[PDB]
Design a protein around this ligand. Structure first.
Ligand SMILES: *[C@@H]1O[C@H](CO)[C@@H](O)[C@H](O)[C@H]1NC(C)=O
Lengths: 50, 46
């Protein structure tokens, strides 16, 4: 079976390229605005540096 | 027994800048080759 005609088909495909960049502040997330809590968070500072 | 001082020539209080002065060892533990973070009563820089 040999074709005797043709069609020019345009297909659309979508690909995600990136996602929303995000940043997090340990101090104001965990220890919202209290100094007493933020002092206790210093010993865990390494974790946030991760 | 005390006596006041009378020959006084006073001016307003002069101010100067603390160039990263006033730091003290926060504890009596030997630490070497390390970056240590501490929160305490410190003289703020400048
Ligand atoms: C001068 O000395 C007396 C006591 O020695 C004291 O009572 C007085 O307050 C002094 N003068 C001033 C202005 O303080």
């Amino acid at each position: 079976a040999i074709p005797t005609n043709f069609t020019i088909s345009v297909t659309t495909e979508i690909l995600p390229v990136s996602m929303t960049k995000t940043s997090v502040d340990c101090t104001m997330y965990i220890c919202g605005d209290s100094t007493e809590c933020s002092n206790l968070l210093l010993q865990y500072g390494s974790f946030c540096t991760q | 027994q005390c006596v006041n001082l009378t020959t006084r020539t006073q001016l307003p209080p002069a101010y100067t800048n603390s160039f990263t002065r006033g730091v003290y060892y926060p504890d009596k533990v030997f630490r070497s080759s390390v970056l240590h973070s501490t929160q305490d009563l410190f003289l703020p820089f400048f």
